Design a protein around this ligand. Sequence first.
Ligand SMILES: *CC(=O)NCC1CCN(C(=O)C(C)(C)Nc2ccc(Cl)cc2)CC1
Ligand SMILES: *CC(=O)NCC1CCN(C(=O)C(C)(C)Nc2ccc(Cl)cc2)CC1
Ligand SMILES: [Mg+2]
Ligand SMILES: [Mg+2]
Ligand SMILES: [Mg+2]
Ligand SMILES: [Mg+2]
Ligand SMILES: [Mg+2]
Ligand SMILES: [Mg+2]
Lengths: 5, 5, 236, 236
Amino acid sequence: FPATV
Amino acid sequence: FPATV
Amino acid sequence: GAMGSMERASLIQKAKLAEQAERYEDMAAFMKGAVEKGEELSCEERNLLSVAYKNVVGGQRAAWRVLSSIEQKSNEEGSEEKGPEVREYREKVETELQGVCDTVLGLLDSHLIKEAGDAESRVFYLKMKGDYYRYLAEVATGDDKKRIIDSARSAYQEAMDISKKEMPPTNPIRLGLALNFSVFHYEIANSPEEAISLAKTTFDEAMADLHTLSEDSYKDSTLIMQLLRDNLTLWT
Amino acid sequence: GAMGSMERASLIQKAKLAEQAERYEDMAAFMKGAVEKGEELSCEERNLLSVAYKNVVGGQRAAWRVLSSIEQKSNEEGSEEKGPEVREYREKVETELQGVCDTVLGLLDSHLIKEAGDAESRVFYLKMKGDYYRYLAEVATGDDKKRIIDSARSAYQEAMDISKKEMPPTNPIRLGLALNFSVFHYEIANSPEEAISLAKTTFDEAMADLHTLSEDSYKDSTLIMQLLRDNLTLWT
Ligand SMILES: *CC(=O)NCC1CCN(C(=O)C(C)(C)Nc2ccc(Cl)cc2)CC1
Ligand SMILES: *CC(=O)NCC1CCN(C(=O)C(C)(C)Nc2ccc(Cl)cc2)CC1
Ligand SMILES: [Mg+2]
Ligand SMILES: [Mg+2]
Ligand SMILES: [Mg+2]
Ligand SMILES: [Mg+2]
Ligand SMILES: [Mg+2]
Ligand SMILES: [Mg+2]
């Protein structure tokens, strides 16, 4: 799954 | 710290 | 609220202790209490609030994915019938996740966003609003699914509009917002081209502004730029 | 209890799902519900019960150590005074830990132990009783500290006596019991020589019985033997 902050 | 199960 | 009797400063102190102990549920409860004191949050305090709930909901999302996958497998042809338990437990975890999202959204609506005048605070809270509607959207299957997705989009878009007017392209809040809005497009809005365009443009405009930064600001900005690159690499 | 209305088999099914999702609090609550149905537990079910509470209390112990260390540092000369918050939050985590221990001990006393007739089940439950009194002992500072330590010792000793009479020296339950009782001696009873003697003797007697085992039993026994060796290496 993709990176989020 | 030591191993326990 | 059970934190009503505790000093604001004590709540913040304990949030920090909870973080050190990796007790994120506690951290989140302490920060909810702090927000409910009704005073605006400093930058450090906003960070504590976001870290707490990110970790709590992050765990719930991971569990929900494990359970949804098992449930999906159960509904494939040839899977022997095992009763309602998988659906029930996925629903249980889902309901708790929605509860946490509703709690965060409630804090933002009552009254963090409306009292946030500076770009850095307002963008930060609107990003959170987008994020927690995005988490609701991940699990949404009903009549309200489209309205949930639009709520996420609308919050992200307002944050984007402010960030572009008021913050430099290397600002970590502007970067993190763009990162997440790009993921919203890829994962939620079925708009991979928009997701890719956004991540690329954000990366490139940041690259061109790095020359203005100190070493420490450079470190902060480039960390998030690398996350944009990681996503682009995943998607292209 | 909130699990009173759920089928025993459904509770077990959901404990397994919770394990897969790393939702150990849920796993523990499901297993408590299953125990409270009043039927004896199978080997697999005993394992689920133990895994659940081990993970829950393991987390609480880790957090308690982080907080106790901060508190210790606060009471060193030259440390500026930061108020009651560190003690309060260490107490909070401590009280929750004691709660979980009391819950497990309550399940064992009502009525797992008294219904456990076979060596493998009885030793397993008495080991758990020792373990959860050991966790209470780690945080105990009052009038009851010695009685808590003795409760741990007594439970471990009964388990040891049965295990030696009824189980081969390579039996994983006998091994795991010895491992933990040895740690009890080192960490709780201030008896490092007893701890070392126990770990060594257990290791050596197991070594000499490995020849009797299948490949799969050999794997199980040697895994725990390596833990005995790890501790001996730590202590010598
Ligand atoms: C008050 C404030 O300015 N917070 C922003 C701060 C920027 C640096 N941070 C980060 O780089 C990490 C740790 C990745 N987290 C976030 C969180 C949210 C956003 Cl919008 C960006 C970056 C910590 C927060
Ligand atoms: C019902 C039963 O026989 N349980 C014992 C089983 C032996 C193998 N196991 C292990 O080796 C590990 C995973 C290390 N855990 C434990 C737990 C408790 C004891 Cl007493 C020994 C080993 C799983 C449990
Ligand atoms: Mg006050
Ligand atoms: Mg639902
Ligand atoms: Mg554009
Ligand atoms: Mg029934
Ligand atoms: Mg106490
Ligand atoms: Mg002896």
